Amino acid sequence: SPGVVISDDEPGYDLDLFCIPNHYAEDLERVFIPHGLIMDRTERLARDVMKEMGGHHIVALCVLKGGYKFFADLLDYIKALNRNSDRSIPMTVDFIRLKSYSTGDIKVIGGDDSTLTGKNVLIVEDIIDTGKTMQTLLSLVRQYNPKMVKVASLLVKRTPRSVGYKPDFVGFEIPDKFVVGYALDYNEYFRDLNHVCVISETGKAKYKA
Amino acid sequence: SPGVVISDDEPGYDLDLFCIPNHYAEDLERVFIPHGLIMDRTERLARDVMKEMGGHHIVALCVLKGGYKFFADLLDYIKALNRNSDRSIPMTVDFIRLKSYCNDQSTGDIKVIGGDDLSTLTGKNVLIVEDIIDTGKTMQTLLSLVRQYNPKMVKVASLLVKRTPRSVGYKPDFVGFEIPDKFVVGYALDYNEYFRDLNHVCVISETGKAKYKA
Amino acid sequence: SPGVVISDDEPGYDLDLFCIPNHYAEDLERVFIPHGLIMDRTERLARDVMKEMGGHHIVALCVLKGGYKFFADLLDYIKALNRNSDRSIPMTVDFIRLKSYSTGDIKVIGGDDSTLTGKNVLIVEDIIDTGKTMQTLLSLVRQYNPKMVKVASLLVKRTPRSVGYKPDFVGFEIPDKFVVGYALDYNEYFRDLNHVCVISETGKAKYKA
Amino acid sequence: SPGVVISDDEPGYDLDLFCIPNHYAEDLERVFIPHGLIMDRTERLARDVMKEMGGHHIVALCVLKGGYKFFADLLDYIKALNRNSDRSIPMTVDFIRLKSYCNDQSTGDIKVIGGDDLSTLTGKNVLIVEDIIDTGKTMQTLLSLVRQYNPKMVKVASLLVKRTPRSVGYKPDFVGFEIPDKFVVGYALDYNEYFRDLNHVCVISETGKAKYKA
Ligand SMILES: Nc1nc2c(ncn2[C@@H]2O[C@H](COP(=O)(O)O)[C@@H](O)[C@H]2O)c(=O)[nH]1
Ligand SMILES: Nc1nc2c(ncn2[C@@H]2O[C@H](COP(=O)(O)O)[C@@H](O)[C@H]2O)c(=O)[nH]1
Ligand SMILES: Nc1nc2c(ncn2[C@@H]2O[C@H](COP(=O)(O)O)[C@@H](O)[C@H]2O)c(=O)[nH]1
Ligand SMILES: Nc1nc2c(ncn2[C@@H]2O[C@H](COP(=O)(O)O)[C@@H](O)[C@H]2O)c(=O)[nH]1
């Protein structure tokens, strides 16, 4: 299942239908995915996750993108599914330093996946674009002979440039457009905006350096 | 603002993508407006209200069918905005059940003298909150009732508003969303006291609609 | 079980340990019960409630105090317990106009409890003081021959003036002091303050009219 | 501020009054600091941080034992405060794992050149967040490491801080709470990757402490 598909021809919402920080008001084009919708769509994701992974210890890894938020918001729901459990069950949390840097940067450095050998792994990225990053990330997590590997992602841009990666868990599948907000940033800006919006030709301009 | 518009042809979302109780998984056709979506719009709305009403003693009046939810929610956003004032300003909260029969006259017990506590409103600033306007009748009969008490200002806030031919054509001041002539349940809206626990707004199905009855 | 007892000799917290609207800063003496603690303590309450009342249709009534908040916050948790249910189960919500006004103001007016005859009832008040209100409220809800009646309350002041009412569900049992915040108000003020605090001789002064 | 103080003699709360997983209902002694309590304090703290740090590009640095929770939470309060600026200001978020052995020298791979991305910090305003300071060692070794990069300002924020004789006697800038020399778990703190799902902070019991092991 593809997640919630948003069409190419999607208009999104006027910036006025919600609360957008006034300081980003010329920088943003449209709200595409309002905060609460992400939340609910994420609640369910968690669920499809546990369906096939609850029951045994798992290792949730965060891609080091610098977008911890979604990872968090998802872990919180994965934790609330775990209480109902009858026996206690550990879970380990972590970031993967690196995502298309390779080899022996994995055999050791990324071999603290020596720690992954034999365990069930769940990788968490926020948006997937060309897929490169991720794919080069399974190659190596793979060398570790993990027992199993799933990949949840919040967004899956549909680009002619996909390099074929299709995660196991999708929240939303989007047009190929440039988004910020919620858990995506731009040069360290838009971290305080919690709806996924399209950025404007102007926004992308002034934010740089 | 027409609030967020939802054209007749909107197909919603399939049950599959959100969390829904399994016991109503047969009683619904599609997710119409998911909880969080509801939430974000309401936050906006609150700002919108205070644009107008803010800085004054506001009397928040609630129109009481089968629930409370929306109101309560909205009010948390308002309160939360009244936190920032350099001056403490009162708020008055009220509940009014009105579904008489028609009106068709009738006395003293519960009706005209429920205006006694209405003089409470007079030279006041009022905010009437409703959840969903259908025909719009209820609303229209309250303005009347209210407008007698000579209020300083009346403003109405709807979460949702249906497009229908069955409408007395009334339009709130603050609309959360304008929807198509569909029967929805969940979040704030009930059907015979069912769906109370469903958070998203959806369209019922015939089975559950026909299965939960009078 | 008495709920969470707070001692006579309780100091509470300095106003500075939390977020209090600056406009009530000379009006309040201490934070006694911070918002989140109420929340959790309420989460559990719900639970003890369902334990003995889940399973059949229930009628949750709110005392018309003019303090809807707690009632709401509790219903929301009672609703989230209901989803896990296998069969769908109705629940009806309402306020009781009146609470130590009597008689035939109950036989009809309060007889829309004719609607209560045969049903399982749950009454919700926010703070109980001398108990009068409530007690005169069971007398009449009783005339209706309800099938069963429980009474949850958020706060139970311990006063020499209790007139003996002891609710079935208690969140916190407090000294005899005058509180505001969360879901308690004073002449329509303090509705925007979400911690339960003690009011000061000054606060009670300027708020009146 | 010592944050909220919890004298050695605090007895906590019994399991009975809050929601706790049944599978840990034998592995804990008492609720020490319930989730919401945690929450309210953190909100305060955020205000406190922006008092000092606010209006500038802040680099938020996270000290990475076994979790993330507190940080994440804190940051929502900060972000939420940066919403109000008439000017958009960046934020930088970072994660630093440091638990070497001691230090005892060692090369190139992961250590000194993890300063390469530290020049990132230099003439910067820094905020180091930790969850619980015990001996205080970890903290002390970071200031050092950090202070080299010549930063414009370092400030540390702890959720909790234990009173112990085993302490290098370091004291954060922002303390959520100062506690007694007890072993706690839950909310943000884990014990061998257990208690991850417990929301309140509590004191372990011998059984679960002795039952979950290395
Ligand atoms: N802010 C933001 N980052 C994006 C967007 N699309 C892709 N990226 C960033 O560029 C990375 C490239 O991922 P890849 O192209 O390797 O699949 C993404 O992982 C993400 O970090 C976008 O719409 N906005
Ligand atoms: N569940 C639900 N109740 C509705 C709907 N339309 C109207 N009603 C109920 O009937 C009332 C209609 O009031 P009107 O505006 O028709 O006078 C609404 O406030 C609501 O309580 C709907 O589509 N769904
Ligand atoms: N604001 C506030 N109201 C209180 C307090 N104690 C009692 N009352 C109000 O006075 C009512 C009297 O309840 P009773 O005295 O009948 O038990 C309470 O139900 C509540 O509405 C208090 O500490 N603060
Ligand atoms: N669960 C838990 N971990 C602790 C406690 N005290 C210390 N630790 C862990 O060990 C670290 C101690 O760092 P120190 O300040 O001792 O250098 C803490 O950040 C924490 O991860 C405690 O009471 N409970």
Side-chain angles (χ1 to χ4, degrees), chain A residues 1-98 104 110-111 115-209, chain B residues 1-97 99-108 110-111 114-115 118-214, chain C residues 1-98 104 110-111 115-209, chain D residues 1-97 99-108 110-111 114-115 118-214:
Chain A
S1 189
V4 181
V5 203
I6 294 186
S7 100
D8 278 345
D9 301 306
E10 258 324 86
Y13 308 87
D14 233 77
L15 292 179
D16 106 274
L17 294 167
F18 316 75
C19 293
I20 271 77
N22 231 265
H23 61 31
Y24 292 139
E26 328 268 38
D27 307 317
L28 291 166
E29 124 169 355
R30 276 304 162 84
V31 175
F32 223 46
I33 328 173
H35 184 80
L37 219 214
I38 285 172
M39 250 197 227
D40 321 281
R41 167 62 180 158
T42 297
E43 187 182 15
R44 151 56 77 132
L45 271 193
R47 207 192 139 240
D48 321 323
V49 154
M50 291 308 275
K51 232 43 210 335
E52 57 201 68
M53 294 189 96
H56 197 235
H57 179 224
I58 56 178
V59 183
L61 318 147
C62 187
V63 189
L64 205 268
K65 134 122 259 309
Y68 69 97
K69 224 271 165 288
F70 162 63
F71 173 63
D73 300 353
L74 175 75
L75 276 233
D76 288 357
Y77 288 109
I78 284 182
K79 276 120 86 227
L81 286 266
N82 285 300
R83 327 197 155 116
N84 336 135
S85 131
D86 306 277
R87 11 158 209 144
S88 35
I89 64 291
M91 167 209 254
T92 109
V93 182
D94 220 346
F95 291 71
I96 1 238
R97 150 217 244 82
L98 272 325
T115 288
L116 313 167
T117 296
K119 287 79 211 68
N120 315 85
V121 191
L122 166 83
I123 309 170
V124 179
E125 200 171 357
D126 55 353
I127 170 147
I128 135 171
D129 189 349
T130 46
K132 227 188 281 216
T133 284
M134 177 58 29
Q135 95 166 352
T136 102
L137 244 195
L138 295 339
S139 314
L140 78 96
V141 68
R142 183 171 52 213
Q143 287 179 1
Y144 280 83
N145 188 32
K147 187 147 89 141
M148 157 202 263
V149 145
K150 253 79 186 69
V151 167
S153 151
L154 200 221
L155 263 29
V156 174
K157 257 145 135 109
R158 74 183 77 91
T159 346
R161 62 220 137 272
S162 202
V163 92
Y165 189 53
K166 28 199 179 259
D168 322 61
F169 302 114
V170 191
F172 301 87
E173 178 208 299
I174 19 188
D176 187 285
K177 288 173 105 187
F178 199 81
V179 293
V180 296
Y182 182 59
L184 282 30
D185 81 282
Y186 181 59
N187 294 342
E188 282 124 10
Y189 294 98
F190 306 106
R191 285 188 125 329
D192 49 304
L193 154 72
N194 37 16
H195 314 106
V196 161
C197 304
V198 173
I199 193 171
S200 56
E201 216 173 297
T202 64
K204 61 194 210 337
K206 32 154 24 183
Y207 306 117
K208 255 264 84 278
Chain B
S1 151
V4 184
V5 171
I6 296 185
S7 78
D8 296 277
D9 70 6
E10 225 338 80
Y13 301 102
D14 29 311
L15 267 46
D16 323 289
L17 300 158
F18 302 90
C19 288
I20 98 132
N22 335 286
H23 59 50
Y24 291 137
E26 186 130 303
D27 314 305
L28 317 148
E29 265 171 38
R30 272 183 143 252
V31 178
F32 231 33
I33 322 191
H35 183 101
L37 224 235
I38 312 272
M39 255 207 58
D40 293 347
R41 218 351 214 166
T42 308
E43 196 192 8
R44 213 343 172 159
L45 276 196
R47 180 285 148 166
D48 279 348
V49 184
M50 312 279 295
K51 85 152 258 178
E52 314 252 337
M53 245 119 265
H56 280 164
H57 173 4
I58 255 164
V59 180
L61 214 17
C62 177
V63 201
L64 225 210
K65 183 210 91 207
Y68 59 110
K69 189 83 141 89
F70 165 71
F71 190 56
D73 291 350
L74 218 216
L75 280 45
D76 292 329
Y77 292 112
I78 313 206
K79 287 194 217 273
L81 293 186
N82 280 321
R83 318 206 177 114
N84 313 269
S85 77
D86 190 32
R87 172 150 210 173
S88 28
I89 268 315
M91 195 151 71
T92 298
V93 181
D94 222 281
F95 310 71
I96 162 67
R97 235 174 230 278
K99 169 190 171 295
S100 17
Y101 250 104
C102 164
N103 340 127
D104 261 298
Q105 319 84 199
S106 270
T107 297
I110 168 194
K111 211 266 175 136
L118 286 217
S119 6
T120 262
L121 309 179
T122 186
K124 274 309 158 196
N125 287 194
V126 205
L127 174 81
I128 314 175
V129 171
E130 205 172 343
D131 59 337
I132 177 161
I133 289 167
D134 189 45
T135 63
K137 256 98 61 176
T138 295
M139 256 316 144
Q140 91 159 29
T141 40
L142 251 163
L143 281 334
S144 320
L145 208 209
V146 175
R147 104 257 223 73
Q148 32 224 26
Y149 316 71
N150 284 172
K152 182 32 145 266
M153 140 178 28
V154 195
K155 231 89 186 146
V156 187
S158 197
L159 196 230
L160 294 161
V161 192
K162 300 206 182 184
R163 268 168 246 119
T164 12
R166 304 170 309 183
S167 163
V168 320
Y170 171 71
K171 218 115 225 159
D173 294 305
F174 302 99
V175 200
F177 311 70
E178 160 184 284
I179 60 146
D181 187 33
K182 277 169 190 45
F183 207 71
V184 305
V185 279
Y187 165 66
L189 312 177
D190 81 271
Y191 182 56
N192 297 352
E193 326 218 272
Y194 290 88
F195 307 113
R196 226 54 140 138
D197 67 300
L198 164 64
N199 355 39
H200 303 123
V201 147
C202 305
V203 184
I204 348 196
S205 68
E206 273 301 328
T207 89
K209 199 235 345 260
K211 145 231 271 207
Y212 290 125
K213 84 295 165 142
Chain C
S1 189
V4 181
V5 203
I6 294 186
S7 100
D8 278 345
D9 301 306
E10 258 324 86
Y13 308 87
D14 233 77
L15 292 179
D16 106 274
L17 294 167
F18 316 75
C19 293
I20 271 77
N22 231 265
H23 61 31
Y24 292 139
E26 328 268 38
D27 307 317
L28 291 166
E29 124 169 355
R30 276 304 162 84
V31 175
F32 223 46
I33 328 173
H35 184 80
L37 219 214
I38 285 172
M39 250 197 227
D40 321 281
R41 167 62 180 158
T42 297
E43 187 182 15
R44 151 56 77 132
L45 271 193
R47 207 192 139 240
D48 321 323
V49 154
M50 291 308 275
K51 232 43 210 335
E52 57 201 68
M53 294 189 96
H56 197 235
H57 179 224
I58 56 178
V59 183
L61 318 147
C62 187
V63 189
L64 205 268
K65 134 122 259 309
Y68 69 97
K69 224 271 165 288
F70 162 63
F71 173 63
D73 300 353
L74 175 75
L75 276 233
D76 288 357
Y77 288 109
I78 284 182
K79 276 120 86 227
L81 286 266
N82 285 300
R83 327 197 155 116
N84 336 135
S85 131
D86 306 277
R87 11 158 209 144
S88 35
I89 64 291
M91 167 209 254
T92 109
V93 182
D94 220 346
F95 291 71
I96 1 238
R97 150 217 244 82
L98 272 325
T115 288
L116 313 167
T117 296
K119 287 79 211 68
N120 315 85
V121 191
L122 166 83
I123 309 170
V124 179
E125 200 171 357
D126 55 353
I127 170 147
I128 135 171
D129 189 349
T130 46
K132 227 188 281 216
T133 284
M134 177 58 29
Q135 95 166 352
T136 102
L137 244 195
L138 295 339
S139 314
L140 78 96
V141 68
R142 183 171 52 213
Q143 287 179 1
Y144 280 83
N145 188 32
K147 187 147 89 141
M148 157 202 263
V149 145
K150 253 79 186 69
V151 167
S153 151
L154 200 221
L155 263 29
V156 174
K157 257 145 135 109
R158 74 183 77 91
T159 346
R161 62 220 137 272
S162 202
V163 92
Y165 189 53
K166 28 199 179 259
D168 322 61
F169 302 114
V170 191
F172 301 87
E173 178 208 299
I174 19 188
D176 187 285
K177 288 173 105 187
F178 199 81
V179 293
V180 296
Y182 182 59
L184 282 30
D185 81 282
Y186 181 59
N187 294 342
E188 282 124 10
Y189 294 98
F190 306 106
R191 285 188 125 329
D192 49 304
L193 154 72
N194 37 16
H195 314 106
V196 161
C197 304
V198 173
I199 193 171
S200 56
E201 216 173 297
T202 64
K204 61 194 210 337
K206 32 154 24 183
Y207 306 117
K208 255 264 84 278
Chain D
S1 151
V4 184
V5 171
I6 296 185
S7 78
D8 296 277
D9 70 6
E10 225 338 80
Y13 301 102
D14 29 311
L15 267 46
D16 323 289
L17 300 158
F18 302 90
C19 288
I20 98 132
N22 335 286
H23 59 50
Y24 291 137
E26 186 130 303
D27 314 305
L28 317 148
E29 265 171 38
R30 272 183 143 252
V31 178
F32 231 33
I33 322 191
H35 183 101
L37 224 235
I38 312 272
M39 255 207 58
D40 293 347
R41 218 351 214 166
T42 308
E43 196 192 8
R44 213 343 172 159
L45 276 196
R47 180 285 148 166
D48 279 348
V49 184
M50 312 279 295
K51 85 152 258 178
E52 314 252 337
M53 245 119 265
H56 280 164
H57 173 4
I58 255 164
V59 180
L61 214 17
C62 177
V63 201
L64 225 210
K65 183 210 91 207
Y68 59 110
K69 189 83 141 89
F70 165 71
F71 190 56
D73 291 350
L74 218 216
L75 280 45
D76 292 329
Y77 292 112
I78 313 206
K79 287 194 217 273
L81 293 186
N82 280 321
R83 318 206 177 114
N84 313 269
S85 77
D86 190 32
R87 172 150 210 173
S88 28
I89 268 315
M91 195 151 71
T92 298
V93 181
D94 222 281
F95 310 71
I96 162 67
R97 235 174 230 278
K99 169 190 171 295
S100 17
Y101 250 104
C102 164
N103 340 127
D104 261 298
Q105 319 84 199
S106 270
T107 297
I110 168 194
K111 211 266 175 136
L118 286 217
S119 6
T120 262
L121 309 179
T122 186
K124 274 309 158 196
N125 287 194
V126 205
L127 174 81
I128 314 175
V129 171
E130 205 172 343
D131 59 337
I132 177 161
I133 289 167
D134 189 45
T135 63
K137 256 98 61 176
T138 295
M139 256 316 144
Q140 91 159 29
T141 40
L142 251 163
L143 281 334
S144 320
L145 208 209
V146 175
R147 104 257 223 73
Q148 32 224 26
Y149 316 71
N150 284 172
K152 182 32 145 266
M153 140 178 28
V154 195
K155 231 89 186 146
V156 187
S158 197
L159 196 230
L160 294 161
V161 192
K162 300 206 182 184
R163 268 168 246 119
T164 12
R166 304 170 309 183
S167 163
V168 320
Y170 171 71
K171 218 115 225 159
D173 294 305
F174 302 99
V175 200
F177 311 70
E178 160 184 284
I179 60 146
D181 187 33
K182 277 169 190 45
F183 207 71
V184 305
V185 279
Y187 165 66
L189 312 177
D190 81 271
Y191 182 56
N192 297 352
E193 326 218 272
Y194 290 88
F195 307 113
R196 226 54 140 138
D197 67 300
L198 164 64
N199 355 39
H200 303 123
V201 147
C202 305
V203 184
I204 348 196
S205 68
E206 273 301 328
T207 89
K209 199 235 345 260
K211 145 231 271 207
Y212 290 125
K213 84 295 165 142

mmCIF file of all heavy atoms in Angstrom, chain C residues 65 125-133 157 177-180 184-185, ligand 3:
data_model
loop_
_atom_site.group_PDB
_atom_site.id
_atom_site.type_symbol
_atom_site.label_atom_id
_atom_site.label_comp_id
_atom_site.label_asym_id
_atom_site.label_seq_id
_atom_site.Cartn_x
_atom_site.Cartn_y
_atom_site.Cartn_z
ATOM 1 N N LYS C 65 -22.348 23.393 36.902
ATOM 2 C CA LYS C 65 -21.457 24.371 37.546
ATOM 3 C C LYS C 65 -21.039 25.548 36.666
ATOM 4 O O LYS C 65 -21.184 26.734 37.019
ATOM 5 C CB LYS C 65 -20.191 23.739 38.098
ATOM 6 C CG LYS C 65 -18.962 24.555 37.713
ATOM 7 C CD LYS C 65 -18.123 25.046 38.895
ATOM 8 C CE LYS C 65 -18.357 26.519 39.250
ATOM 9 N NZ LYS C 65 -18.237 27.418 38.085
ATOM 10 N N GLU C 125 -18.711 16.123 38.608
ATOM 11 C CA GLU C 125 -18.512 17.424 39.198
ATOM 12 C C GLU C 125 -17.027 17.689 39.264
ATOM 13 O O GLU C 125 -16.218 16.812 39.152
ATOM 14 C CB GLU C 125 -19.205 17.652 40.556
ATOM 15 C CG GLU C 125 -19.393 19.156 40.908
ATOM 16 C CD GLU C 125 -20.278 19.317 42.136
ATOM 17 O OE1 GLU C 125 -20.736 18.179 42.576
ATOM 18 O OE2 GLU C 125 -20.563 20.382 42.665
ATOM 19 N N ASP C 126 -16.644 18.923 39.367
ATOM 20 C CA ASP C 126 -15.241 19.219 39.410
ATOM 21 C C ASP C 126 -14.679 19.264 40.872
ATOM 22 O O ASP C 126 -13.792 18.509 41.252
ATOM 23 C CB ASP C 126 -15.022 20.502 38.624
ATOM 24 C CG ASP C 126 -15.898 21.572 39.154
ATOM 25 O OD1 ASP C 126 -16.761 21.385 40.014
ATOM 26 O OD2 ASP C 126 -15.634 22.729 38.613
ATOM 27 N N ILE C 127 -15.204 20.098 41.729
ATOM 28 C CA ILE C 127 -14.729 20.032 43.048
ATOM 29 C C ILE C 127 -15.873 19.867 43.988
ATOM 30 O O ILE C 127 -16.929 20.456 43.838
ATOM 31 C CB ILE C 127 -13.942 21.256 43.468
ATOM 32 C CG1 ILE C 127 -13.708 21.153 44.994
ATOM 33 C CG2 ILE C 127 -14.746 22.514 43.084
ATOM 34 C CD1 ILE C 127 -12.390 21.759 45.465
ATOM 35 N N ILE C 128 -15.668 19.035 44.964
ATOM 36 C CA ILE C 128 -16.671 18.912 45.984
ATOM 37 C C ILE C 128 -16.197 19.548 47.248
ATOM 38 O O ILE C 128 -15.004 19.439 47.610
ATOM 39 C CB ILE C 128 -17.397 17.591 46.193
ATOM 40 C CG1 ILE C 128 -17.569 17.096 47.607
ATOM 41 C CG2 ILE C 128 -17.633 16.616 45.039
ATOM 42 C CD1 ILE C 128 -18.497 15.880 47.632
ATOM 43 N N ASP C 129 -17.105 20.322 47.818
ATOM 44 C CA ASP C 129 -16.794 21.055 48.986
ATOM 45 C C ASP C 129 -17.563 20.549 50.178
ATOM 46 O O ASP C 129 -17.020 19.743 50.919
ATOM 47 C CB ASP C 129 -16.856 22.552 48.725
ATOM 48 C CG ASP C 129 -16.322 23.354 49.877
ATOM 49 O OD1 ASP C 129 -16.102 22.687 50.973
ATOM 50 O OD2 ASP C 129 -16.108 24.526 49.809
ATOM 51 N N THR C 130 -18.768 21.113 50.438
ATOM 52 C CA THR C 130 -19.592 20.680 51.593
ATOM 53 C C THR C 130 -20.390 19.433 51.229
ATOM 54 O O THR C 130 -20.882 18.761 52.117
ATOM 55 C CB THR C 130 -20.571 21.743 52.154
ATOM 56 O OG1 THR C 130 -21.246 22.347 51.074
ATOM 57 C CG2 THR C 130 -19.915 22.801 53.077
ATOM 58 N N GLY C 131 -20.479 19.151 49.902
ATOM 59 C CA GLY C 131 -21.171 18.003 49.321
ATOM 60 C C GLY C 131 -22.668 18.232 49.036
ATOM 61 O O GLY C 131 -23.289 17.454 48.320
ATOM 62 N N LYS C 132 -23.250 19.280 49.614
ATOM 63 C CA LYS C 132 -24.678 19.591 49.510
ATOM 64 C C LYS C 132 -25.261 19.378 48.105
ATOM 65 O O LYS C 132 -26.152 18.539 47.877
ATOM 66 C CB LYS C 132 -24.885 21.035 49.965
ATOM 67 C CG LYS C 132 -26.039 21.263 50.940
ATOM 68 C CD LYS C 132 -26.316 22.743 51.193
ATOM 69 C CE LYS C 132 -25.363 23.398 52.178
ATOM 70 N NZ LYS C 132 -26.042 24.415 53.022
ATOM 71 N N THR C 133 -24.661 20.106 47.174
ATOM 72 C CA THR C 133 -25.050 20.061 45.811
ATOM 73 C C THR C 133 -25.246 18.673 45.262
ATOM 74 O O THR C 133 -26.216 18.319 44.632
ATOM 75 C CB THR C 133 -23.954 20.776 45.065
ATOM 76 O OG1 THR C 133 -24.080 22.172 45.258
ATOM 77 C CG2 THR C 133 -23.993 20.417 43.609
ATOM 78 N N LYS C 157 -12.330 18.560 48.568
ATOM 79 C CA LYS C 157 -11.808 19.342 49.657
ATOM 80 C C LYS C 157 -12.121 18.665 50.936
ATOM 81 O O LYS C 157 -13.224 18.204 51.100
ATOM 82 C CB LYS C 157 -12.490 20.664 49.779
ATOM 83 C CG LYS C 157 -11.660 21.782 49.242
ATOM 84 C CD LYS C 157 -12.568 22.791 48.615
ATOM 85 C CE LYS C 157 -12.231 24.220 48.973
ATOM 86 N NZ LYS C 157 -11.664 24.938 47.835
ATOM 87 N N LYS C 177 -8.765 24.733 51.025
ATOM 88 C CA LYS C 177 -8.220 26.020 50.561
ATOM 89 C C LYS C 177 -8.971 26.478 49.303
ATOM 90 O O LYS C 177 -9.663 25.690 48.684
ATOM 91 C CB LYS C 177 -6.693 26.037 50.395
ATOM 92 C CG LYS C 177 -5.951 26.040 51.706
ATOM 93 C CD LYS C 177 -4.439 25.875 51.559
ATOM 94 C CE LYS C 177 -3.687 27.182 51.790
ATOM 95 N NZ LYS C 177 -2.241 27.080 51.487
ATOM 96 N N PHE C 178 -8.839 27.729 48.890
ATOM 97 C CA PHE C 178 -9.588 28.163 47.734
ATOM 98 C C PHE C 178 -8.820 28.157 46.399
ATOM 99 O O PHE C 178 -8.024 29.047 46.075
ATOM 100 C CB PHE C 178 -10.342 29.474 48.010
ATOM 101 C CG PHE C 178 -11.464 29.674 47.012
ATOM 102 C CD1 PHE C 178 -12.684 29.021 47.179
ATOM 103 C CD2 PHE C 178 -11.274 30.453 45.869
ATOM 104 C CE1 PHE C 178 -13.702 29.161 46.241
ATOM 105 C CE2 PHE C 178 -12.278 30.603 44.914
ATOM 106 C CZ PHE C 178 -13.473 29.917 45.090
ATOM 107 N N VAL C 179 -9.141 27.179 45.575
ATOM 108 C CA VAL C 179 -8.464 27.033 44.309
ATOM 109 C C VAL C 179 -9.185 27.507 43.009
ATOM 110 O O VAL C 179 -10.393 27.533 42.846
ATOM 111 C CB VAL C 179 -7.948 25.601 44.193
ATOM 112 C CG1 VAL C 179 -6.849 25.328 45.205
ATOM 113 C CG2 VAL C 179 -9.093 24.602 44.381
ATOM 114 N N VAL C 180 -8.381 27.827 42.033
ATOM 115 C CA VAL C 180 -8.787 28.216 40.702
ATOM 116 C C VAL C 180 -7.817 27.562 39.683
ATOM 117 O O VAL C 180 -6.735 27.039 40.042
ATOM 118 C CB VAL C 180 -8.647 29.706 40.522
ATOM 119 C CG1 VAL C 180 -9.580 30.454 41.450
ATOM 120 C CG2 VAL C 180 -7.216 30.063 40.861
ATOM 121 N N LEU C 184 -11.738 25.301 37.188
ATOM 122 C CA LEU C 184 -12.370 26.102 38.224
ATOM 123 C C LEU C 184 -12.173 27.594 37.863
ATOM 124 O O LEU C 184 -11.093 27.958 37.404
ATOM 125 C CB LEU C 184 -11.628 25.863 39.537
ATOM 126 C CG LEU C 184 -11.936 24.577 40.271
ATOM 127 C CD1 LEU C 184 -12.310 23.493 39.296
ATOM 128 C CD2 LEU C 184 -10.681 24.172 41.042
ATOM 129 N N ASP C 185 -13.197 28.449 38.054
ATOM 130 C CA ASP C 185 -13.085 29.878 37.729
ATOM 131 C C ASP C 185 -13.494 30.739 38.881
ATOM 132 O O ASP C 185 -13.969 30.255 39.880
ATOM 133 C CB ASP C 185 -14.000 30.267 36.574
ATOM 134 C CG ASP C 185 -15.421 30.504 36.992
ATOM 135 O OD1 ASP C 185 -16.116 29.393 37.187
ATOM 136 O OD2 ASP C 185 -15.881 31.624 37.089
HETATM 137 N N1 LIG E 3 -13.617 28.160 42.283
HETATM 138 C C1 LIG E 3 -13.922 27.349 43.270
HETATM 139 N N2 LIG E 3 -15.179 26.938 43.459
HETATM 140 C C2 LIG E 3 -15.297 26.202 44.599
HETATM 141 C C3 LIG E 3 -14.298 25.842 45.476
HETATM 142 N N3 LIG E 3 -14.784 25.001 46.458
HETATM 143 C C4 LIG E 3 -16.060 24.899 46.199
HETATM 144 N N4 LIG E 3 -16.449 25.657 45.123
HETATM 145 C C5 LIG E 3 -17.657 25.889 44.336
HETATM 146 O O1 LIG E 3 -18.786 25.928 45.223
HETATM 147 C C6 LIG E 3 -19.572 24.719 44.988
HETATM 148 C C7 LIG E 3 -20.186 24.177 46.250
HETATM 149 O O2 LIG E 3 -20.128 22.749 46.281
HETATM 150 P P1 LIG E 3 -20.652 22.202 47.676
HETATM 151 O O3 LIG E 3 -20.211 23.204 48.703
HETATM 152 O O4 LIG E 3 -22.117 22.211 47.435
HETATM 153 O O5 LIG E 3 -20.041 20.867 47.811
HETATM 154 C C8 LIG E 3 -18.594 23.772 44.387
HETATM 155 O O6 LIG E 3 -19.316 22.806 43.759
HETATM 156 C C9 LIG E 3 -17.920 24.704 43.401
HETATM 157 O O7 LIG E 3 -18.803 25.052 42.340
HETATM 158 C C10 LIG E 3 -12.984 26.291 45.232
HETATM 159 O O8 LIG E 3 -11.961 25.993 45.834
HETATM 160 N N5 LIG E 3 -12.904 27.118 44.119
#
